[PDB]
Amino acid sequence: DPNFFKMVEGFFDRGASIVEDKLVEDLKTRETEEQKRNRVRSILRIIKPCNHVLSLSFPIRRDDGSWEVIEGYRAQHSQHRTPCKGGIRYSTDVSVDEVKALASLMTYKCAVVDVPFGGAKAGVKINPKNYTDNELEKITRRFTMELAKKGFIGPGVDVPAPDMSTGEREMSWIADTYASTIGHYDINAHACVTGKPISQGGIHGRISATGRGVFHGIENFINEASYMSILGMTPGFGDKTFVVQGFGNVGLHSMRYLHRFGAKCITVGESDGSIWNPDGIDPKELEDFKLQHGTILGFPKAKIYEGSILEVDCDILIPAASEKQLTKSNAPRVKAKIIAEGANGPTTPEADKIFLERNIMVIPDLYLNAGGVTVSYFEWLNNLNHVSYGRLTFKYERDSNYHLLMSVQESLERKFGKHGGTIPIVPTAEFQDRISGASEKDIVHSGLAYTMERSARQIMRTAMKYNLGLDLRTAAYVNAIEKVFRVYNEAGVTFT
Amino acid sequence: DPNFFKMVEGFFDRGASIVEDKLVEDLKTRETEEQKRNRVRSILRIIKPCNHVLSLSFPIRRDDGSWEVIEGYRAQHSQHRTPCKGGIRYSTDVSVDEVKALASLMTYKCAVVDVPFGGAKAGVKINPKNYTDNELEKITRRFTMELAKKGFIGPGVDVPAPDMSTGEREMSWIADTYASTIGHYDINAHACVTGKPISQGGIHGRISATGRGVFHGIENFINEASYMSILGMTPGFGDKTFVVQGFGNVGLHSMRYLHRFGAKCITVGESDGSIWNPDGIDPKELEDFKLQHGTILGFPKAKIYEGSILEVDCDILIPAASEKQLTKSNAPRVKAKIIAEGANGPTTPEADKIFLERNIMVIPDLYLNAGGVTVSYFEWLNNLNHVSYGRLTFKYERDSNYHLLMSVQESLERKFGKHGGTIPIVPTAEFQDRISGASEKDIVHSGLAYTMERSARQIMRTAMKYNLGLDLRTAAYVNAIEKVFRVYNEAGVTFT
Amino acid sequence: DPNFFKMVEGFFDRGASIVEDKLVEDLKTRETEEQKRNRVRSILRIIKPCNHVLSLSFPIRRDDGSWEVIEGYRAQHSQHRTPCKGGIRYSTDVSVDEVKALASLMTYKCAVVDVPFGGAKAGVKINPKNYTDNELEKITRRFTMELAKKGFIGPGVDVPAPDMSTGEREMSWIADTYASTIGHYDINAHACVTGKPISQGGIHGRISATGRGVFHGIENFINEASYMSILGMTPGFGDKTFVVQGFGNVGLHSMRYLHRFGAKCITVGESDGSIWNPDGIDPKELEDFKLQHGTILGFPKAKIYEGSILEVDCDILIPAASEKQLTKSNAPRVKAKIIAEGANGPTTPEADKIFLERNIMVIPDLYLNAGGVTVSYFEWLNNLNHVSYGRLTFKYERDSNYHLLMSVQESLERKFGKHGGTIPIVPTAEFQDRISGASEKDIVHSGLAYTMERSARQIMRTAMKYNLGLDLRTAAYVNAIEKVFRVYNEAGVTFT
Ligand SMILES: Nc1nc2c(ncn2[C@@H]2O[C@H](COP(=O)(O)OP(=O)(O)OP(=O)(O)O)[C@@H](O)[C@H]2O)c(=O)[nH]1
Ligand SMILES: Nc1nc2c(ncn2[C@@H]2O[C@H](COP(=O)(O)OP(=O)(O)OP(=O)(O)O)[C@@H](O)[C@H]2O)c(=O)[nH]1
Ligand SMILES: Nc1nc2c(ncn2[C@@H]2O[C@H](COP(=O)(O)OP(=O)(O)OP(=O)(O)O)[C@@H](O)[C@H]2O)c(=O)[nH]1
């Protein structure tokens, strides 16, 4: 049970060794092979660590009149490409080391998806549940009152974001503080953060984003025969066994979108148990009980399945919530062709090997749960371009989108409308639905997928280049580094 | 052999005289004809000079331990419309006067193409070749360390750029300095400069931009019969003799794009000699030797042509590199209907007259080599909107771009698909190539051409308005001034 | 052998317990004894920790072309009273914990002497000796390039300073960086740091300051009979045995000033050995060999004394350099009435008890080595008032300083100068020496002593108030906290 930090650090190291072999070969500087090799080697010593790490102490007053001190950490991995991004996490497992990872992680996560942001993250040694709303509203707006004094929060330095144990309220609190302490005139203050509610500049779609980011991520591969062949599987979703573990968020919004395109999901894993219905389960009906029961168990159309989800005979498996759920004890026990890994580090390094030995494909946590980052990026622009996307264009496009058809109509009626036969060219129900449903919801759904699309394709290439086969986890950490490295190299690596 | 400055100044003067005749007539102020004429007249005394010109001195330390002082000049023509733009030039021909021109030039260049920027330029009395990479990296990052202390470098004051003797490295160096001296949080620091590499916010297409800007510039005229008639020529490129002088950059990337649309280029001029093949030459094969030989001479499929390119019997002639190449001695000797003038001041004032007497059309250096500016402008936005263009839209457009076709299909199958005959409407190879090739490369190629398109059209008008016929050089300097003047007039000309 | 951190933390804790007993009694708020006691108690939980602690990573390039990463720490104890102060230390013993102490220390050190500054400190995991001057000049100016991006260096946030392993050069380097990265116009940039050379705004006297701060600190007690009586000693210095350990700096400049006022120093401790001359030793003659020999040993007029300085039969003992030199093994072995503790933590907690049991007075490291801080404060003003002290006044005072005497002369000659007898009132050699020697050297020497004077007096009071007798170390940590606490209380303790 290594520390998730040590997991990460262990990976990057491996990727570096892989990269260097050629990265030195494809370096176009006039130097000695040795000389230049000592350039790259150290650069891969430079980015790995996290530049700035700050430790705090808060004199907050409780509701009972008492005082207590609070520790808070912010980690800003690398300045190679600002601004920097990172969510906040209120918990008691926090620690300096636990952070540097996730910042040094999100960075690599962002690069895979071609995002400018730089990785960061913060945390606080605290358990929210023991504290009220007011207290938390006293904590937060003081937290981001300090960091702002110290240049770790600004629309072009560092951008907080949500995470488990947080929500819009928390964000909403922050942004106000900033505007009342720093911006005071600065227009870009509305971009201080992300994940805001919709009324201030948020997004129609954030909540389900991640779940989607999983989906289009899987799609870019399942529809890829080059790997179907390897796993003896078939392209498409119309005939496949799908399951989930970590119901709730990302487990769900994916399950639903998943159900949409011909999927047949079978099971559900929950902190309290499981279910099973080889006939396929409606996510909708489950959405109900999650609110009408606070649990999955008791679902009429599924048996309370004994055992872990992982041991289910299926095609896909989605460890959306549990961390380190896959071990050498289960890796052989799993029954699946593919794994998703929505959550971060649901899988152990040892297992990955076992899968590669079982010819089991997987997906890296980076790629999938990225969409929860991607969307933010978009939301970080809405607050900069100070508009909802498209509102200058929807109707214009619309107009053109049916002046054309008219042109077609006339063009045809002109040629073989000889007798005058009219061709009432019209939209399609769907296409008409898009039109009247014109809204950011459609844009984002697009600028998200395209992203996840392009990224995957780069990865496949990256895999082939290095003959990694199905060992994508590395391949991603690979494709990331090359981008990162390439950046830091072309930045005048340092002015000292 | 006047100084390129004196050339410029000589032109503007001429344009003013031409403009005033009507600019006073079309001025809508309640004044006396005389009174108002004394308004315009002086305004054309105001813009002409360059407001700010700074002279520097650098205590740099060589690699040998020695010190030496270095002089550096920055010229910011006019504040009438900030920000201001201007590249850098490392040479020993530099001088205050040599600058004011090019700044006072780029301004007028920018206006022709409807660009906000204001003209500037910098230079340094130095010969790079005698200095290392490190030294230059010591020079530059100190150069832009001073100017920043003094408000001549900022994403909304003044924007450096490349030029001969410079490259991405130089830029890349600068931007880092700025972020480490001024921005420190400012998001727009990524726009401090332009011409950056691609990894930081550069562009897919810069290198060939200029060459293209030449092309679409020629196209907007060759396809214009109104001038074909005058020169007894034909519209199109499918039947014309093309040549070049100044092979390398802009000479090349144009030659290639030129070759694409039915051109037949015949010759090449190079600092070391020339070639000739009335059968037409593949730029590609030339691209090879330029790298496999560092020269054109020795090209199998062309004779080493004796004489200057200018004296070749052709339809187009492109003095892409040489300066002041066209004199009264050659002006009559030239064999051509049109000239391009990619470079700046390849042609002499005296010659222009001779051409007008020989009924020879030409093109102003302003218009053509503008694209090397235009593109930058775009690149200056990529770093402000903090995105690669379109990524929010490509797939959305894509979707719509084939939901429509479906609509057509259904619409037709509905009317005279009576028996059920299906119409498998599909894209075209080309159109499908666009789609999968979706990228900035296509956007920029567009927002460039359109620009060069609209501009030309304004010029034609401007020519007709003033009955200049083929004497475009003036006409441009004309169309520019009116815009400029119009700006400075509507700006509350001055608050003093 | 506890960590110097743990030493410190152990002290403050003790002081708090002592303070609270009355601090709650002298709190003038309308509350319940319990209620208010829960106010103070926690406040003494708040100040103790250090608010901001930053960890860094530097991509520096060596002279050999290689790269290496460097870690650097800055600790800004408390914002209760900005700006904050702290020197820098280049070593390899550095660590986060090792810092928080010294920052949380200097704070309390500053308060004793009624200084606004807030404690901070920085360090770097590095050994200078293995690196050149250039490298260090590459390290430093990058170090303070980051911290400035992050608001840990500024004339009104945080003020670096020298320390062992540093010197004026290091400072001089920094200040330039700042002016070239942040100030750019800010007048107060000349105050970014302290310890500067004299040519930029430094001070005539810094080097010997500390040594002096020791002296006047001892004087305020030795001349105090109230404690002479306790130790059975005599006031004055004219008859006392003085010694030293840690020759070099502070050991020396004190020894000299010490020699001036009737002292008779006997021995010297050095890293390499010792000497002894009951006849008294001229510091001057020693100054010579320290430069003519790099050592004390071989001094003609002193025997190479076997044993540690501590075991010498004397009246005063000055552990100026060695850390943790005094242990339970030596505490009883020491032969002395008083200890100085110029260095930080030369003495162990256990020993202090033993001394109190041996009726041995001591002095806290805080008080004495403070002068090295005090002076800086002054130097931090020279760079703000942008003048050398007094230059507006010396001659004015001078004038008045002898218009008076004239008045006396005339006044006397008027009354009983009846016959006309003239009274040539004149200055004294000394007083005339002051005049012609008018310079900062005299001011600082004053504003230093007065400080150390007033402080001590507060401490005596503080001791009596709490009946600590000779256990001053606490008493200081006591007098400090009350000031600190009092500050943080009257600051609207927090706006959350
Ligand atoms: N679909 C769905 N949405 C939910 C659920 N719970 C909360 N939501 C929120 O409701 C919103 C519904 O999104 P819509 O914009 O109405 O429809 P959509 O974006 O096209 O797709 P869905 O989000 O799946 O409905 C989502 O953005 C979620 O934030 C749920 O169980 N199912
Ligand atoms: N075409 C071409 N590109 C070159 C040449 N030399 C360097 N390049 C670079 O290669 C890039 C090729 O551009 P692409 O994006 O691949 O293709 P394109 O932009 O549609 O058109 P081309 O630039 O002419 O290839 C250009 O942007 C140049 O910067 C050359 O000789 N020919
Ligand atoms: N006195 C003294 N000064 C030294 C010695 N070594 C270096 N110095 C420097 O020389 C300066 C001499 O100070 P001065 O201003 O000339 O005289 P002062 O300040 O009245 O008293 P001193 O510093 O003891 O000489 C001090 O500030 C030190 O920085 C030394 O061994 N003895």
Which CATH number goes with the domain that contains B20? 1.10.287.140
Say yes or no for a CB contact (<8 Å) between A150 and C151: yes
Q: Cα dihedral angle (C433, C437, C441, C447), rounded to 10 degrees? A: 60
Contact A430, A322 (CB under 8 A): no
Place of tokens 């053109």: A400
Which residues does ligand 1 sit against, CB inside 6 Å? A 204-205, 207-208, 256, 287, 441
Which chain A residues are closer than 8 Å to C152 by Cβ?
Answer: 150
Q: Is B121 a catalytic residue?
A: yes
Contact C189, C156 (CB under 8 A): no
Distance CA B131, CA B67 (A): 13
- Residue A174's SS3 state is helix
Mark residue C155 as left, alpha or beta (left: phi above 0; alpha: psi -120 to 50; beta: remaining): alpha
Residue A256 is labelled as binding a ligand: no
Q: Cα dihedral angle (B368, B373, B377, B380), rounded to 10 degrees? A: 150
At A44, list the tokens.
Answer: 């891969």
Which residue is closest to A79 within chain C, CA to CA?
Answer: C146
Say yes or no for a CB contact (<8 Å) between A66 and C38: yes
Q: How far is the CA of C444 from the centre of ligand 3 (A)?
A: 14
Distance CA B313, CA A413 (A): 51
At C349, list the tokens.
Answer: 């907690």
Does residue A432 sit in the same domain as residue A327?
Answer: yes
Ligand approaching nearest to the C-alpha of B439: 2
Q: To the nearest whole angstrom, how far is the Cα of A229 from the nearest Cα of chain B?
A: 24
Eight-state DSSP code of residue C271? T
Q: How far is the CA of A258 from the centre of ligand 1 (A)?
A: 13
Distance CA A213, CA A201 (A): 21
Provide the annotated binding site of B for substrate.
Answer: 85, 109, 376
- C207 close to ligand 3 (CB < 6 Angstrom): yes
What subunits touch chain C, counting only 3 or more CB pairs under 8 A?
A: A, B
Does residue C46 sit in the same domain as residue C84?
Answer: no
- Written in H, E and C, the secondary structure of chain B is CCCHHHHHHHHHHHHHHHHHHHHCCCCCCCCCHHHHHHHHHHHHHHCCCCCEEEECCEEEECCCCCEEEECEEEEECCCCCCCEECCEEEECCCCHHHHHHHHHHHHHHHHHCCCCCEEEEEEEECCHHHCCHHHHHHHHHHHHHHHHHCCCCECCCEECCCCCCCCHHHHHHHHHHHHHHHHCCCHHHHHCCCCCCHHHCCCCCHHHHHHHHHHHHHHHHHCCHHHHCCCCCCCCCCCCEECCECCCCCHHHHHHHHHHCCCEECEEEECCEEEECCCCCCHHHHHHHHHHCCCCCCCCCCECCCCCHHHCCCCCCCECCCCCCECCCCCCCCCCCCCCCCCCCCECHHHHHHHHHHCCCCCCHHHHCCHHHHHHHHHHHHHHHHCCCCCCCHHHHHHHHHHHHHHHHHHHHHHCCCCCCCCCCCCCHHHHHHHHCCCHHHHHHHHHHHHHHHHHHHHHHHHHHHCCCCCHHHHHHHHHHHHHHHHHHCCCCCCC
B148 alpha carbon, distance to own chain's centre: 26
Alpha helices in C24-122 (DSSP H): 33-46, 96-112
Nearest partner of A405 among B395, B406, B394, judged by Cα: B406
At C265, list the tokens.
Answer: 């120093």
Q: How far is the CA of A389 from the centre of ligand 1 (A)?
A: 19
Say yes or no for a CB contact (<8 Å) between A68 and C43: no
- C288 close to ligand 3 (CB < 6 Angstrom): no
* B189 exposure class (CB count in 10 Å sphere: 0-12, 13-18, 19+): buried
Please tell me the total count of domains within chain B. Answer: 3
> Which backbone phi and psi does C289 adopt, to 5 degrees?
-65, -35
Distance CA C119, CA C102 (A): 8
Distance CA B217, CA B209 (A): 12
Does residue A92 sit in the same domain as residue A153?
Answer: yes
Distance CA A155, CA A179 (A): 11
> Which backbone phi and psi does B75 adopt, to 5 degrees?
-130, 120
Place of tokens 């007075």: C361
For C400, other C-beta atoms within 10 Å of its C-beta total 10
> Which backbone phi and psi does C58 adopt, to 5 degrees?
-120, 120
Q: Tell which of C184, C200, C216 closes a domain.
A: C200
Return all residues near C193 (Cβ < 8 A) that are at least 6 apart.
Answer: C159, C160, C161, C171, C174, C175, C178
Residue A77 is labelled as binding a ligand: no
Return all residues near C300 (Cβ < 8 A) that are at least 6 apart.
Answer: none
B392, B399, B407 ranked by CB distance to A428: nearest: B407
Which residue is closest to C152 within chain A, CA to CA?
Answer: A150
At B167, list the tokens.
Answer: 């490259």
Does residue C258 sit in the same domain as residue C350?
Answer: yes
Domain hosting B7: range is 1-51
Question: What is the C-alpha radius of gyration for chain C, rounded to an integer number of angstroms?
Answer: 25
Contact B263, B254 (CB under 8 A): no
Nearest partner of C172 among C155, C147, C191, C197, judged by Cα: C197
Distance CA A20, CA A24 (A): 6
At C451, list the tokens.
Answer: 């400080």
* C63 exposure class (CB count in 10 Å sphere: 0-12, 13-18, 19+): exposed
Does residue C212 sit in the same domain as residue C266?
Answer: yes
CATH number for the domain spanning B171: value is: 3.40.50.10860
C137 alpha carbon, distance to own chain's centre: 27
- Residue C32's SS3 state is coil
Ligand approaching nearest to the C-alpha of B291: 2
> Which backbone phi and psi does B356 adopt, to 5 degrees?
-50, -30
Does residue B239 sit in the same domain as residue B337?
Answer: yes
Which residue is closest to B145 within chain A, CA to CA?
Answer: A495
Which chain B residues are closer than 8 Å to C149 by Cβ?
Answer: 180, 184
Distance CA C8, CA C86 (A): 17
What are the CA-CA distances from residue B43 to residues B6, B36, B469 (Å)? Answer: 20, 11, 27
The technique is cryo-EM
Distance CA B59, CA B142 (A): 9
Say yes or no for a CB contact (<8 Å) between C56 and A52: yes
Place of tokens 């001590």: C456
Q: Cα dihedral angle (A208, A214, A217, A218), rounded to 10 degrees? A: -130
- C256 close to ligand 3 (CB < 6 Angstrom): yes
Q: To the nearest whole angstrom, how far is the Cα of A451 from the nearest Cα of chain B?
A: 8
Say yes or no for a CB contact (<8 Å) between B145 and C184: no
- Residue C347's SS3 state is strand
Say yes or no for a CB contact (<8 Å) between B396 and A83: no
Q: List residues of chain B with CB under 8 Å from any CB of chain A.
A: 137, 141, 168-169, 172-173, 175-177, 179-180, 183-189, 197, 199-200, 385-388, 391-396, 399-400, 403-404, 406-408, 410-412, 415
Q: To the nearest whole angstrom, how far is the Cα of B285 from the nearest Cα of chain A?
A: 24
Does residue C7 sit in the same domain as residue C21?
Answer: yes
> Maximum Cα–Cα distance for chain C, whole Å?
91
Contact C305, C275 (CB under 8 A): yes
Best mutation site among C204, C208, C216 for ligand 3 pocket (most ligand atoms within 8 Å of CB): C208
> Which backbone phi and psi does C267 adopt, to 5 degrees?
-130, 180
CA angle centred on A307, ends A304 and A312, rounded to 5°: 95
Alpha helices in C56-205 (DSSP H): 96-112, 133-149, 168-178
The full DSSP string for C417-444 is: -TT---------HHHHHHHHT-SHHHHH
At A408, list the tokens.
Answer: 């077609």
Which chain A residues are closer than 8 Å to C96 by Cβ?
Answer: 55
Distance CA C189, CA C168 (A): 17
B386, B392, B404 ranked by CB distance to A389: nearest: B392
First to last CA, chain C: 41
Nearest partner of C486 among C83, C80, C119, C13, judged by Cα: C80
> Which backbone phi and psi does A405 adopt, to 5 degrees?
-45, -50
Which atom of ligand 2 is found nearest the CA of B283? Answer: 31
- C212 close to ligand 3 (CB < 6 Angstrom): no
Does residue C26 sit in the same domain as residue C124?
Answer: no
Which chain B residues are closer than 8 Å to A487 by Cβ?
Answer: 199-200
Does residue B34 sit in the same domain as residue B57?
Answer: no
Which chain B residues are closer than 8 Å to C145 by Cβ?
Answer: 180
- The resolution in Å comes to 3.5
Nearest partner of C320 among C386, C357, C269, judged by Cα: C269
Does residue C423 sit in the same domain as residue C286?
Answer: yes
Q: Cα dihedral angle (C237, C241, C245, C251), rounded to 10 degrees? A: 20
Ligand approaching nearest to the C-alpha of C440: 3
Return all residues near C61 (Cβ < 8 A) that are at least 6 apart.
Answer: A494, A496, C67, C138
Which residues does ligand 2 sit against, CB inside 6 Å? B 204-205, 207-208, 256, 287, 441
Q: Tell which of B12, B33, B51 closes a domain.
A: B51
- Residue C85's SS3 state is strand
Residue type at B362? V
- Residue A243's SS3 state is coil
Distance CA A397, CA A152 (A): 41
Catalytic residue among A28, A36, A48, A121: A121
Does residue A74 sit in the same domain as residue A206?
Answer: no
> Which backbone phi and psi does C338 adopt, to 5 degrees?
-135, 155
- Residue C158's SS3 state is strand
Q: Tell which of A31, A51, A71 closes a domain.
A: A51
Q: List residues of chain C with CB under 8 Å from any CB of chain A.
A: 35, 38-39, 42-43, 45-46, 49-61, 65-69, 96, 138-139, 141-142, 145-146, 149-152, 493-496
Nearest-CA residue for ligand 2 atom 29 is B207
Nearest-CA residue for ligand 1 atom 23 is A208
Chain B interface disruption, residue of C132, C141, C180, most B CBs within 10 A: C180
List residues in chain B that are followed by a break over 2.5 Å (C to N): none
Distance CA B191, CA B384 (A): 6
Residue type at A420? G
Say yes or no for a CB contact (<8 Å) between B149 and C181: no
Peptide bond preceding C83: is omega within 30 degrees of 0, i.e. cis?
yes
CATH number for the domain spanning A432: value is: 3.40.50.720
Which chain B residues are closer than 8 Å to A110 by Cβ?
Answer: none
- Residue C38's SS3 state is helix
Does residue A186 sit in the same domain as residue A210?
Answer: no
Nearest partner of B87 among B110, B70, B64, judged by Cα: B110
Q: To the nearest whole angstrom, how far is the Cα of A117 from the nearest Cα of chain C?
A: 18
> Which backbone phi and psi does B97 adopt, to 5 degrees?
-60, -40
Which atom of ligand 3 is found nearest the CA of C290? Answer: 31
Say yes or no for a CB contact (<8 Å) between C45 and A60: no
Contact C314, C237 (CB under 8 A): no
